[PDB]
Amino acid sequence: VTKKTIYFDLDNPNSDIDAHIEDLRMHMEDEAKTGTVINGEEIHIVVDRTFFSKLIKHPKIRDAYLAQQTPLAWQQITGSLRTGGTDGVQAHMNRFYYGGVVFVQ
């Protein structure tokens, strides 16, 4: 088989993160080849520190979330984040919610 790498291009302000997430979903929905129906939302994304920082910094996600009066929007922006279990050294791990998928640092 061939490994699949997805380039999010978080540095470019004009990049569409939605397209990259849709690619990540459809790769698991199509390349599974298991013969059954597949839901691509459950993909266990594990993220490095710099990737997480660049993802939460991106202007598209920030502007999509600044204009929403929901507790989630108040949490992801100007909020604590750090919503998760322990990894061994920290009580909680950073987790960001966007597009039905979860990025865990």
Partner 1 sequence: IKAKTYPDFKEFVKDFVANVKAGKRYDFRKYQEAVLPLTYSSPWPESDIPEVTDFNYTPDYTVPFSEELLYSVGAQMRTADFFMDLQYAIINGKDVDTVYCEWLARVKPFSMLNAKLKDS
Q: Are 94 and 80 spatial neighbours (Cβ–Cβ below 8 Å)?
A: no
Q: Which of 11, 48, 71, 89 binds partner 1 (CB under 8 A)?
A: 11
User: Rule CB under 8 A: is residue 78 a binding residue for partner 1?
Assistant: no
- Chain CA centroid to CA 1, Å: 25
DSSP class of residue 75 equals H
Nearest approach in angstroms of CB 24 to partner 1 is 18
Contact 40, 29 (CB under 8 A): yes
Find the binder of partner 1 among 26, 59, 68, 82 (CB under 8 A).
59
Return residues touching partner 1 (CB under 8 A): 10-14, 16, 59, 63, 66-67
